[PDB]
Structure 1
Amino acid sequence: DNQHKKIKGYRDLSQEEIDMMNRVKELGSQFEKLIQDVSDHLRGQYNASLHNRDEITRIANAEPGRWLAIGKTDIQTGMMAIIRAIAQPDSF
């Protein structure tokens, strides 16, 4: 019901702008797949390293799950900024 026109900052977008935005989102989905793969790798690494207290300590000290989460958040906020550069909402 044209909900977007009810939200402050709405701007009419061309097809080229919509296509660029969807390009961002589809490259983002490839990053989501990569991040899932890394997370699976981390889980297998943690598993295979069970009862290797030195290697469990190494993994805990490198904090890879935390770094993967930081990376996911940066990728997602970067996508939002790029999409904002295309959409150009009039609002602050």
Structure 2
Amino acid sequence: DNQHKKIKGYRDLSQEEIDMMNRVKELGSQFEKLIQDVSDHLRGQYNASLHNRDEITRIANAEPGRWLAIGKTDIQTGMMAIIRAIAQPDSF
């Protein structure tokens, strides 16, 4: 379909550009694995700390699940910006 040629901003890309975009994506998958690992650590920390009210309150005050979510969003939009720097669409 060459669907991309139907989207505004399309630019033809070299293999080097594609490889660089794929590299950002592969590095991102390593961050995704790391984030899943941190999330499992947090789930365990909470489970172990059940019934310890002071530690449950400490975890709630630290808001680690929220901070992990912020980090995930920043990593992903950062990847998107690096890829746009490579792909260089001809649109605003």
The normalised TM-score by structure 1 is 1.00
Tell me how far apart the structure 1 counterparts of residues 3 and 41 of structure 2 sit (CA, whole Å).
42
Partners of 1:11 and 1:41 in 2: CA distance: 43
Could you tell me how far 1:59 is from its partner in structure 2?
A: 0.1
Tell me the alpha carbon deviations over residues 20-76 of structure 1, each in whole angstroms, 9 at most, x when there is no partner.
000000000000000000000000000000000000000000000000000000000
The runs of at least 4 consecutive aligned structure 1 residues that moved more than 6 Å come to none
- Identify the residue that residue 56 of structure 2 maps to in structure 1: 56
Structure 1: how far apart are the matches of 2:32 and 2:11? 29
Between the aligned residues of both structures, percent identity stands at 100
SS at match of 2:12: coil
- For structure 2, which runs of at least 5 residues remain unmatched after alignment? none
TM-score normalised over the length of structure 2: 1.00
CA distance in 2, matches of 1:77, 1:27: 13
